[PDB]
Design an enzyme around this catalytic site. Sequence first.
Site, short mmCIF file in Angstrom:
data_model
loop_
_atom_site.label_atom_id
_atom_site.label_comp_id
_atom_site.label_asym_id
_atom_site.label_seq_id
_atom_site.Cartn_x
_atom_site.Cartn_y
_atom_site.Cartn_z
N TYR A 255 68.90 56.16 24.48
CA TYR A 255 70.08 56.05 25.19
C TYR A 255 70.35 54.80 26.16
CZ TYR A 255 70.01 60.89 24.49
OH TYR A 255 69.65 62.36 23.92
N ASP B 18 71.49 39.27 25.70
CA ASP B 18 71.30 40.54 26.35
C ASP B 18 70.09 40.75 27.11
OD1 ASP B 18 72.11 43.27 27.18
OD2 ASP B 18 72.18 44.07 25.01
N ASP C 143 69.76 43.34 20.68
CA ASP C 143 69.38 44.36 19.90
C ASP C 143 70.35 45.17 19.68
OD1 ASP C 143 69.38 45.27 22.69
OD2 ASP C 143 67.60 46.94 22.02
N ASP D 167 68.25 44.18 28.62
CA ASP D 167 67.38 45.36 28.60
C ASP D 167 67.19 45.35 26.94
OD1 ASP D 167 67.31 46.61 30.91
OD2 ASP D 167 69.40 47.16 30.81
N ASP E 102 64.36 64.00 25.64
CA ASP E 102 63.10 63.99 25.06
C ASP E 102 62.72 62.14 24.61
OD1 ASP E 102 61.18 66.22 24.40
OD2 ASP E 102 63.09 67.18 24.25
N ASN E 103 63.64 61.55 24.44
CA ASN E 103 63.66 60.16 24.12
C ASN E 103 64.82 59.53 24.80
OD1 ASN E 103 62.93 57.73 23.02
ND2 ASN E 103 63.50 58.20 20.91
#
Length: 217
Positions: A45, A9, A164, A11, A40-41
Amino acid sequence: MSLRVILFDLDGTLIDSAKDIALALEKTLKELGLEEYYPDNVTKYIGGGVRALLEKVLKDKFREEYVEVFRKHYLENPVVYTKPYPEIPYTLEALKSKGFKLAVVSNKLEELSKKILDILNLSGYFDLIVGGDTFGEKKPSPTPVLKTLEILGEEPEKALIVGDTDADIEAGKRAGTKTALALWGYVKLNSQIPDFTLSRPSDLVKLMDNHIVEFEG
């Protein structure tokens, strides 16, 4: 365990891109007047593609044309903060010299995947770079893994998929390949059990040193 090909993968596996994704998201919400939605984080996503990202961020305000907007802005600045994860260049060099074929398969747009790896000078390590659009964005899992392997001339049982996300592992299992979790990425919890769990990239190389993985001539 005898293998011939390793598929990564992008990213959160080969590259630490969250800051450049955030930069594109920022320019996107400004274009669209949706600033209050900036989360906020943002790293929460990252993984499923630009579409999945915008859908979770915008919820009821999401529109399919916003994907093109995001991609446009990301393409105006594909690499600002983005870097290979520590030990990534080392690990690619080691694998390739042992004779593995290497490929990138991800949800990121192919054009952008190629542009990023060119700028980071990693393109060279790879026999094939595959993005969400390469074989068609609408295709069901695990077609991109399968088609990449068919192009490379290699069987699933001789391939290792490194990523991941649980979705990366699940696609490996559908294709019948071996799988490895990359724990250095963005995902904080995982419910898939891969063949291998890697806490740093050079861990791949240790498995090779112990003949836990070997390259199959």
